[PDB]
Structures are given as structure tokens and as C-alpha cells.
Symmetry: C2
Subunit: 314 residues, 2 copies
């Protein structure tokens, strides 16, 4: 897995640009910032832009990391208790901007109106409120036709080096028989728990059966969320193939640590991901990540978006 | 319809950048150029960048034009007799890069493997042997309007046409949907899966080789569409400001569906009467939203003497990986 290590000079330039932009724009509520994003991302160090572009175009690896950012711990301040009621943007606005810049290099930032107040940057920190742990991995929103194409995870702080899990598809293990079955529309994937108007909420609803593999039959994409995946009982070939696919992916899972100053890029088409359970202090010094969802085609999701301009689904 | 007119200064800066890039890069066969495209496009005049970005994000107008480019006629040379057997790249390489920079501001340039040797930037000029019938390389005969490859799930999201020369000012026809000209009842019908759109003969899997699994799977979805003949909508997106796919020559309204026939005829009249002539004169670059506009060309008399109309054409996709199944490798931008 290729990764990019920032020099002190690259890290200083990135930090400086990130502070200049934060002072220049109000928030992500500023429509002109969302407009300028791709042009702004061109002001990043050229090696960083080149690296990400190669990741995007290569379409080979499930994940990549840019390491060595300068995330000023004094400015960022203590890891908050919760996300709701918290004034946005915070002092960590610079870092959120960075992820939005990276997102603009891979596509467009988008989010869910019903998730975290519909903020384009998600918070990932221990919560005393929302508190034997099963170890799960999934494709992000595997059921959804307009699911993320990429995820960007920025490690603001990670004092105990708690890894993320990411897994890819090894084809050598699977037979051609099983692959062909998985490519066919024979599987149900269920949604999740996720204003009055216009045509209320649940719009373009639940419909057909779909495949688990797609794209190239020699190097396929996947959407795999094992907990919410069911196969019709009469379909024994599909059940045999789903079993074999699960074994390959489950047994291939890797631990990847996003330490402080790391940005992890996950390809939602080539890789599954999962959180790892960890003992939290709850004292403002806890592990803290930011997450941005990236779509390659914003217009493809128009029917589930309130307006043309909005990047929030639902 | 909003447009952008380059000041002579912007025109000068664009040409300079374009010449520099032409010298620094060998051809489009260079993967690094494809890699560098959007970082390179960030070197264009800032007004231009902001203009296209606003066009892309507004998702309202179906076409726009950037006018006032300096396309140097001495450097570009005579309009060629044919696209086959030309030295790649030609003396007009700088103009090709410009269109590739523009495409990179809207998405990713892509092509069709069997079209003009698989070049990302297409030539549009009269070819004598091609002068009998309707196409983009003839001249004498009418090109009735349409959505590009309306049937195809991975059709272009945008088209970019650059006018290297147009001495007789032969316009391009483009038409949009005036939604207020249709009844609410007819709109509901058009959003429903009640219509058959047939592929152009060029996309038929039986055209290419029957050999191997790799090639069979690469056409398997298109072949399924031909065998099952699924019915589809002609309007989609949001019911308030909808996308359209309308290729009248390849659209079948099933005989017994009377509601569909009424709605279609209605949609046809609106789009036919809204057809506008947009002249892509020398130095003009036309952007077409393939989800919000239809396009065609007018018939014109060609001279075949190296002075004829010459356009360059690039196809843009907003999501390159969506079409992976129909591409030989991950690297290739060519479907088929
Ligand atoms: Fe997740
Ligand atoms: Fe056409």
C-alpha cells in the first residue's frame, strides 16, 4: 500500500494555507468556499496533488495514507463531549478545510441531512452518552445507490494508537463459478436507522435485488455489509457464493493506524472498513477523527436532494 | 443563457499556457498529462475557472459558451482531408490541450474505443468520401438533434466543442426543455418507465469480435438491454427541473400506450420549437450539458481545399469508474 510522507516544508505549507483559508471564509455554510474548493486544492504542494491523483486514477488499492501533517494540538483544543449543540466551526476549522480540499481532489464532498445535523464534516470521538463488543466491517451505506465513492479520515489525535480496520478482495481464493453468481442481482441489502417538505422523507424507496460484485470480472468492485445482507432461502448457489466471499474478506482484514497527523483515504468500492473497540478516558484527550464523504457524481443523486445546490442527501 | 467573453489579455494568457503545455508534453499517449490535467487547468485565467465551476454547480442551464480565444491560424494549418494517417499530435495540439483542460474542470475526458482510433479529442471536418448521409464528418446533409447516446447508461454528461475555424459561420443547433410548456399530467408520464430507447448501431456487441470471455463480459450489459428491451423514462432527476434523454430516431413509443404517445408528442414539439442556433465561430468553445440539452448540426457545402470548418470534440464523464465493466483496463478511458 503506497503512502505519502510530508516533509516539514510540505507540512508547513499545508498548515499555512489551511490557516489562510480558515480566516478567509466563514464556514462550510459559505457557498463561495464550496465553489472555490477545487481551485483552492491546487494551492496544495504539488507532490500531494500528484499522489492523490495517481491513487484515484490507478483504481487498484483499497486505501492510502498521507502522513506527517502538522495538526497544532494547542489550537485544536480538547476533544469535546458531543457533536450536537456544539458551535460550528470550531478552532479545528483549519483541519476540516484540509479534508474538504482533499475531497475536492477526489470528487465532491457530500453528506446526509439526517446524520450529525447534516454537517459535511463528521466527528469521530468517544461519547459517554452513546455508550462484549462484536468486531464488524462494512462497505459504507452498501444498500444505497448513491453511497460514498471514497471516505477521508483525518486523525486529529490518537494517543493510544487505536487502528482502523480495512479489507480488500483477493480474487485468487474465489472460483469463477462463485464470482459469476455474485455479479448477478440475487442479494438483498437492508438500510439503517438513518423539516416537513417537500415530498416527505422516504421518497425513492426499497425496490429490487442486487449484486455483491460489479465492474470488471477480473478485478471487481464490492458492496459488502454482512449484518444487513440476506439471501433468499431457495437460492443455494448465491448462499454458497456469499459464504465464500465473506470468508475471503473477513480473513483478509488488516489493521491500519491513523496516528496524529495522518489522513486515511478509503476507496468505498475496493475496500470494507470497521471501527475497533477501545478504552476511552473521556477527559478531553481522547482519540478524535474527522470524516468526509466523497461522491464522484453529485448530479446522479439529484432526486434525493432538496435542491440543486445542496450536497445533503435526504 | 450566460456566456463568457475573454478579454484580449485572458486570450493571450490562455494561448501562452497552451503553447507551454504543448511543448512540455509529447502527446495524449503520455499518462502523466492525463494525470496532471486538473492541476494544469488551475493555471487558466481565474474568471474562466469560476465561470465553468458556477456552470457545473448551478445545474440549471443546458449549455454555455466561452468566446474570444486566440486560435493562431498560421500555426494550426490547413483543415485536413481525413483523420486517419495524420501525424500525432498535429500543429493544433495546443487547442486540443485547451479542450482537455476544460474537460478536466467538468469531470474526466473519455472516448469510445472504435471511434476515430480511440483519440480523446475528436476531429470534426468534412471528409469527401463521407459526404453522403447524416453524421459529424459529412457536410451536405442535416443532422437532426438529439441527446448523445441516450440509450447508454454511461453516455457523456458533457460535450465540449471547440471551433478551430468556421469561415462561413455554420452554426450548431442546441435545444433545452422549457418545463412550463408541458402539462403536469404529461410530465408524470415522461418520468415513468414507458419508453424504449434503442442503441446506435455502433454500440451493438455483435459488431465486434465474438472471441474470449473478457470481450463478452465487456458488452454483457448492453447485450442484456437488447435482449430484454427494458422500458425507460425520458425525464429524470427532479420533477421541478428535470434531466432529459431524447433521441427521437431511436425512441419507440409502444403502440398501445396512448398516454405515452400524447406526452411524447408534447415533449417533441416543445424541444423542436425551442431549438436555437448557436454559432461556434473561430475562437469559440461550446459546452453542452448532455442531461439538459439536445444538439445537432446544419447541412453545409464543403470545399475540401483545406479551408473548411474544423471543430474539436471532447466527451466528459462525471464518474469514470461507473463504466469500468466496459473498459479493458483500469487505466484506459475508452469504452469498448
Ligand atoms: Fe462506517
Ligand atoms: Fe451527436
Amino acid at each position: 500500500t503506497p503512502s505519502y510522507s510530508l516533509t516539514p516544508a510540505e507540512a508547513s505549507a499545508v498548515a499555512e494555507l489551511t490557516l489562510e483559508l480558515a480566516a478567509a471564509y466563514g464556514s462550510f455554510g459559505d457557498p463561495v468556499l464550496l465553489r472555490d474548493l477545487p481551485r483552492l486544492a491546487a494551492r496544495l504542494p504539488e507532490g500531494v496533488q500528484d499522489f492523490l491523483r495517481e491513487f484515484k486514477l490507478a483504481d487498484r488499492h483499497g486505501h492510502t495514507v498521507i502522513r506527517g501533517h502538522d495538526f497544532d494540538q494547542r489550537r485544536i483544543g480538547p476533544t469535546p463531549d458531543h457533536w450536537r449543540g456544539r458551535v460550528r466551526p470550531g478552532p479545528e476549522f483549519p483541519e476540516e478545510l484540509l479534508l474538504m480540499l482533499y475531497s475536492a481532489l477526489l470528487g465532491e464532498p457530500f453528506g446526509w441531512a439526517t446524520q450529525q445535523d447534516g454537517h459535511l464534516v463528521h466527528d469521530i470521538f468517544p461519547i459517554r452518552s452513546h455508550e462484549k463488543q462484536l468486531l464488524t466491517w462494512h462497505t459504507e451505506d452498501a444498500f444505497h445507490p448513491y453511497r460514498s465513492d471514497y471516505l477521508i479520515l483525518g486523525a486529529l489525535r490518537n494517543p493510544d494508537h487505536v487502528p482502523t480496520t480495512v479489507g480488500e478482495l483477493d480474487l485468487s481464493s474465489l472460483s469463477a463459478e462463485d464470482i459469476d453468481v455474485l455479479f448477478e442481482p440475487r442479494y438483498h441489502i437492508a438500510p439503517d436507522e438513518s423539516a416537513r417538505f417537500a415530498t416527505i422523507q422516504r421518497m425513492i424507496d426499497e425496490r429490487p435485488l442486487g449484486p455483491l460484485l460489479y465492474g470488471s470480472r477480473l478485478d471487481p468492485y464490492m458492496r459488502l455489509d454482512p449484518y444487513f445482507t440476506s439471501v433468499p432461502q431457495d437460492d443455494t448457489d448465491a448462499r454458497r457464493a456469499y459464504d465464500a466471499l465473506f470468508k475471503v474478506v473477513d480473513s483478509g482484514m488488516r489493521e491500519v493506524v491513523a496516528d496524529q497527523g495522518d489522513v486515511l483515504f478509503i476507496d468505498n468500492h475496493r475496500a470494507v472498513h470497521g471501527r475497533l473497540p477501545f478504552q476511552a478516558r473521556y477527559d478531553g484527550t481522547d482519540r478524535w477523527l474527522k470524516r468526509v464523504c466523497v461522491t464522484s457524481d453529485l448530479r446522479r443523486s439529484r432526486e434525493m436532494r432538496a435542491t440543486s445546490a445542496t450536497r445533503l442527501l435526504g
